[PDB]
Design a protein around this ligand. Structure first.
Ligand SMILES: O=c1nc[nH]c(=O)[nH]1
Ligand SMILES: O=c1nc[nH]c(=O)[nH]1
Ligand SMILES: [Zn+2]
Ligand SMILES: [Zn+2]
Lengths: 156, 157
């Protein structure tokens, strides 16, 4: 299930990814939403200053650990422009966050990166290989070409 | 594949894991060693304050990204009492650290946790399934029962 409301959040993730690209970082953005539908926290990739672990899903996991009780974490949704790498999927599950919705799969990105000779040093594992209990929805097919464009701008 | 010097560092990791256990955290310890044999940073698990991501291998990855050039990271070694979880294995690869030596594998721990009904929400994937290019050595048969007992002291029933 990717609802109309889900797609709106995913479109905000894409806007954050573009913000990251325009700032010199890599095009990934993510938002954390409460069960009430209140946006709690938003972030984007910040690796350009030297720390390759500065992925927004990871920032969300640590933010949730600090600011939400486990019960609220479990009922929260994370939206992301790109499917959590294994680092971020593992962090998500460790802190006990709930549903993940992503725009493009890590398989999509890995395929595109392979076309450009830009493969990552971390494997493109689907979230549920890393985090078997997490409910995962995605990809949103309507956002494939849009995200491919941002990825190409960075890695192409 | 585990030298005398390597085993000394793994024994320090077990000491750090015991410090963690005694302090109310979980028994994981890690050390980052330069190519010269100097200890650069030592850490242990700190999850008791409510952040389940407070793993020492991850702290080491961020320490490396802050303080070391890529060439120095590639020549550094990370020792750990327990094989990196996927969070920590990925972080290690993202930052471009080098060899990992571990005392016990995540499969070993996973089997033991199953004995106690204390399964993690993160899969027990081998490091090279997450980070295919990393050189990985371990486990160390000499530290199997030591580490089994420390894990039992936190997770056992
Ligand atoms: O910021 C990021 N988020 C997911 N994967 C990735 O490579 N980078
Ligand atoms: O601190 C930790 N380091 C690795 N795995 C784990 O579950 N915890
Ligand atoms: Zn990530
Ligand atoms: Zn870990």
């Amino acid at each position: 299930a990717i609802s109309d409301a889900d797609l709106k959040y995913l479109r905000r993730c894409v806007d954050l990814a573009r913000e990251a690209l325009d700032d010199g970082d890599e095009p990934f953005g993510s938002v954390l939403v409460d069960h009430t539908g209140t946006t709690l926290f938003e972030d984007r990739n910040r690796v350009k200053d030297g720390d390759a672990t500065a992925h927004p899903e990871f920032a969300i996991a640590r933010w949730a650990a600090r600011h939400l009780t486990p019960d609220r974490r479990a009922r929260a949704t994370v939206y992301t422009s790109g499917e959590h790498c294994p680092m971020c999927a593992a962090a998500h599950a460790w802190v006990g966050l709930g549903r993940i919705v992503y725009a493009t799969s890590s398989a999509q990105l890995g395929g595109w990166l392979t076309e450009w000779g830009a493969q990552a040093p971390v494997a493109t594992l689907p979230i549920n290989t890393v985090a078997p209990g997490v409910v995962v929805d995605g990809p949103a097919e309507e956002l494939a070409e849009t995200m491919h464009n941002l990825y190409r701008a960075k890695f192409g």
